Amino acid sequence: HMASLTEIEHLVQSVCKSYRETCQLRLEDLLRQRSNIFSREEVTGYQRKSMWEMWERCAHHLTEAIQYVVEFAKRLSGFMELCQNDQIVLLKAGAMEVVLVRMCRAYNADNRTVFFEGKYGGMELFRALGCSELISSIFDFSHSLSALHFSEDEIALYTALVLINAHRPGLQEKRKVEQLQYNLELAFHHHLCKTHRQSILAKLPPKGKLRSLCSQHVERLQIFQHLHPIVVQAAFPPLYKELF
C-alpha cells in the first residue's frame, strides 16, 4: 500500500549502467574535445565530397548508433523477457528517436557544433548531402535538449521510456509493456525527486515533436538507402529485415 524503494533504486542503477555500457564515447571525451573544431579547409574538404560519399559516412555512423541502442534495449530488465514481435515493434518505432536524443551529448550549444569523425563542426560540414532543412531541424532539436542540461542518468532513464512505450501500434503482450513502463516511470520520477529536477518532466519535448522529427529523418534515410544502399551486418536481423 506504499512504494518499494530498494526495487526502484535497483532499476535506476541497472538502466544507468546499461546506458553507460552502450554509449559510443563517454561524456567526458566529448566535453574535453569541445575546443577541437574543424578548420575552414577541413570544412571545405567535406563540402567537396560527393553526395553519396557523405551519405555513406553518415549512414554508417547512424546504423552503428542504432546498434548501440539495440544493445541498450537488450540489457533493459524485462525487454529480453518479452516476445520477439514486441521487441521488434518497440525498436522499429523507437530506436531512432533514442539516437536523436543521444545526439545532444555530442552537440555543443555554445558554438552550435557536433562531434563528427573526431572533431567539432557546424551544420555546413554536411552541405554535400543537400539536406539543409532536415540537418537544421536536427541541430534545432539538439539545441532544445541542451537547454535542459541533462545528466547522463536523466538521458538513460528518459531514452529507456522513449523505447518502452505501451501505446506503440501492433504490440501483443500490451500489459507486460505497461508494467515495464510504469516501473520505468516510478524509477525516473524517483531519481528526479532525489536530485530536485522533477520540474523537467513538464519541459521535456512534446511527444509529437520527437515523432515528427523522426518521421522526417527516417523518410530521408529510406530514399537514400534506395538510391545508394550501404551494406549492413545486422545485429537484430528480424528488425533489420523489416526496414531494408
Ligand X SMILES: CN(C)C(=O)c1ccc2c(c1)c(Oc1c(Cl)cccc1C(F)(F)F)nn2-c1ccc(C(=O)O)cc1
How many residues belong to the site for ligand X (CB under 6 A)?
23
CA angle 209, 213, 217 (to 5 degrees): 165
Using Cβ positions, the residue closest to ligand X within the complex turns out to be 96
Instruction: Check if the beta carbon of residue 47 is closer than 8 Å to that of residue 127.
Output: yes
CA distances 143 to 93, 109, 188, 206, 227, Å, are 23, 6, 23, 15, 31
User: Applying CB under 6 A, does 223 fall inside the site for ligand X?
Assistant: no
* Cross-strand pairs, 120: 37, 115
User: Applying CB under 6 A, does 214 fall inside the site for ligand X?
Assistant: yes
x-or-dash string of contact with ligand X, 77-106, rule CB under 6 A: --------------xxxxxx----------
80 or 234: CB nearest ligand X: 234
Q: Residue 173, Cβ neighbours under 10 Å: how many?
A: 15
- Which residues lie below 8 Å from residue 182, measured CB to CB, with a gap of 6+? none
List 13, 44, 195, 222, residue binding ligand X (CB under 6 A): 222
List 12, 54, 59, 180, residue binding ligand X (CB under 6 A): 59
Name the residues that contact ligand X, by CB under 6 A. Answer: 59, 62-63, 66-67, 91-96, 214, 218, 221-222, 225, 232, 234-236, 239-240, 243
